């Protein structure tokens, strides 16, 4: 696996229900990965059930860890978020230490990847939970980008949740990021918007839209790889 | 840049104290692999400066361990930016690094920087009060902090005990789990034999305050490790 060659990804939420016909269609759309997310309140049994539903298809299935209890074996990849702009140590390192203290063994039998998370949308569920200073200036965002690239993180995930983020903030971030792979998530609900950001981000993430209007989020893939 | 993986012994100097006579010189031509300018409480831009001009003339690498942004001085071969993995204050984990990237970005790109995973393991010292470190830890805690250090990609994991010698057994176990980063052990080393004993597991032993209390004896630690 190599994220430096991805262009598009779907982020599903084990918390919501998706008709299996649609789950099947996404896995076989041409996307580069299907990431199982879950901002919060995620249950182990929903992750497990999803993992078994997507394991058959060839696309790499990724687990985005957000709760120790939700760790489940069987995924091709494991992404460990590290919220860089959190005012709380638990979301940067703390929760990460409790996890290694508890599953340090199983955390050697998988390909794990650290993501430098930058939550730039101040009004979403994610920014409230992590006590993130999510209201940032272009120069704040770019500095976090820098940090991530200093700490050397395979990924810098610029996160804007349910809203489209500033295309300029994305263009610059990309400019400082020499080694990290920039992921952009936030408001991409169609081919038009997918194209705009894909031009600046290495990878664009499409989640919510999948639930809102499936038919049209499906076009984000062809829109950036067609 | 210089490769710390090839190092074994480093001397750590306090810019807020100066060595008598030709001592800085003997120390700089001793056989040490690097001379680190660090410092406690508050370091000053004036002290760092005076040190930097003094040590930069020798072939040995000189390093600035950036404890405070206000002491960021140009002229060093390397800058160690530490993240205190066990701190309760996000400032000490990433908050500083982002400040420096926001106020001194251009200076950053033109210097060779290295992130170091600090783990303050002595709950009774300046450093721990200063960083709000959850400094009371069993080998298990410490071992887990080192695995976070590696997930996070940090090239160095600094296990620090300050004024006291650390558990020889926490050193061997952390050395154990470290697959791809260098183990710096700092703490209470003031002689050849104690030096000899920690060099068995730590990749690098740091010798700090012992050069002020007993120069001639701190100096023997180099031979005792090579
Ligand atoms: C347990 C461990 C090793 C580390 C802790 C992991 C951390 C820091 C998790 C928080 C990451 C979050 C909430 C990301 C946004 S998910 P989303 O896009 O799904 O948000 P939404 O549900 O749509 O509101
Ligand atoms: O919520 P959206 O608008 O889909 O953005 C993707 C999101 O889930 C990234 O964390």
From Swiss-Prot, chain A:
Tell me the Gene Ontology biological-process terms attached to this UniProt entry: glycerophospholipid biosynthetic process
Q: Which Pfam families match?
A: PcrB (PF01884)
* Domain of life of the source: Bacteria
Pathway given for this chain reads:
Membrane lipid metabolism; glycerophospholipid metabolism
A GO term, aspect molecular function: heptaprenylglyceryl phosphate synthase activity
**InterPro entries per the record?**
GGGP/HepGP_synthase_I, GGGP/HepGP_synthase_sf, GGGP_HepGP_synthase
From the record, give the cysteines joined by S-S bonds: none
Recorded hits in SUPFAM superfamilies, A to Z, give:
FMN-linked oxidoreductases (SSF51395)
- Keywords annotated in UniProt: Lipid biosynthesis, Lipid metabolism, Magnesium, Metal-binding, Phospholipid biosynthesis, Phospholipid metabolism, Transferase
General function of this protein:
Prenyltransferase that catalyzes in vivo the transfer of the heptaprenyl moiety of heptaprenyl pyrophosphate (HepPP; 35 carbon atoms) to the C3 hydroxyl of sn-glycerol-1-phosphate (G1P), producing heptaprenylglyceryl phosphate (HepGP). This reaction is an ether-bond-formation step in the biosynthesis of archaea-type G1P-based membrane lipids found in Bacillales. To a much lesser extent, is also able to use geranyl diphosphate (GPP; C10) and geranylgeranyl diphosphate (GGPP; C20) as the prenyl donors, but not farnesyl pyrophosphate (FPP; C15).
The entry describes its oligomerization and partners as: Homodimer.
Q: Which family does it belong to?
A: Belongs to the GGGP/HepGP synthase family. Group I subfamily.
Query: What's this protein's name?
Result: Heptaprenylglyceryl phosphate synthase
Q: Record the organism.
A: Bacillus subtilis (strain 168)
Q: Which gene encodes it?
A: pcrB
Curated annotation (Swiss-Prot), chain B:
Here the disulfide bonds are none
Q: Which cofactor does it need?
A: Mg(2+)
Pathway(s) annotated for this protein in UniProt: Membrane lipid metabolism; glycerophospholipid metabolism
State if Acetylation is listed as a keyword. no
Which InterPro entries does this entry report, sorted A to Z? GGGP/HepGP_synthase_I, GGGP/HepGP_synthase_sf, GGGP_HepGP_synthase
E.C. number, please? 2.5.1.n9
User: Which Pfam family, just one, is annotated for this protein?
Assistant: PcrB
Q: Which Gene Ontology BP annotations are present?
A: glycerophospholipid biosynthetic process
Summary of subunit composition and partner proteins? Homodimer.
| Name of the protein in its database record | Heptaprenylglyceryl phosphate synthase
Q: Which gene encodes it?
A: pcrB
């Amino acid at each position: 696996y190599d994220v430096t060659e991805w262009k598009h990804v779907f982020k599903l939420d084990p918390n919501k229900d998706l008709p299996d016909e649609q789950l099947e269609i996404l896995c076989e759309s041409g996307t580069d990965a299907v990431i199982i997310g879950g901002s919060d309140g995620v249950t182990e049994d929903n992750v497990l059930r999803m993992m078994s539903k997507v394991r058959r298809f060839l696309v790499p299935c990724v687990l985005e860890v957000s709760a120790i209890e939700a760790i489940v074996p069987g995924f091709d990849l494991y992404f460990i978020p590290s919220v860089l702009n959190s005012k709380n140590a638990d979301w940067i390192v703390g929760m990460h230490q409790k996890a290694m203290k508890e599953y340090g063994e199983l955390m050697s039998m998988e390909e794990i990847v650290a993501e430098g998370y930058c939550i730039a949308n101040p009004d979403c569920k994610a920014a409230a939970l992590t006590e993130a200073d999510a209201d940032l200036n272009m120069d704040d965002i770019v500095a976090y980008a820098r940090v991530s690239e200093l700490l050397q993180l395979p990924i810098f995930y610029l996160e804007y949740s349910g809203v489209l983020g500033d295309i300029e903030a994305v263009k610059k971030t990309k400019a400082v990021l020499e080694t990290s792979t920039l992921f952009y998530g936030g408001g991409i609900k169609d081919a038009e918007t997918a194209k705009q950001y894909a031009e600046h981000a290495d990878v664009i993430v499409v989640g919510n839209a999948v639930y809102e209007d499936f038919d049209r989020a499906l076009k984000t893939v062809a829109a950036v790889k067609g």
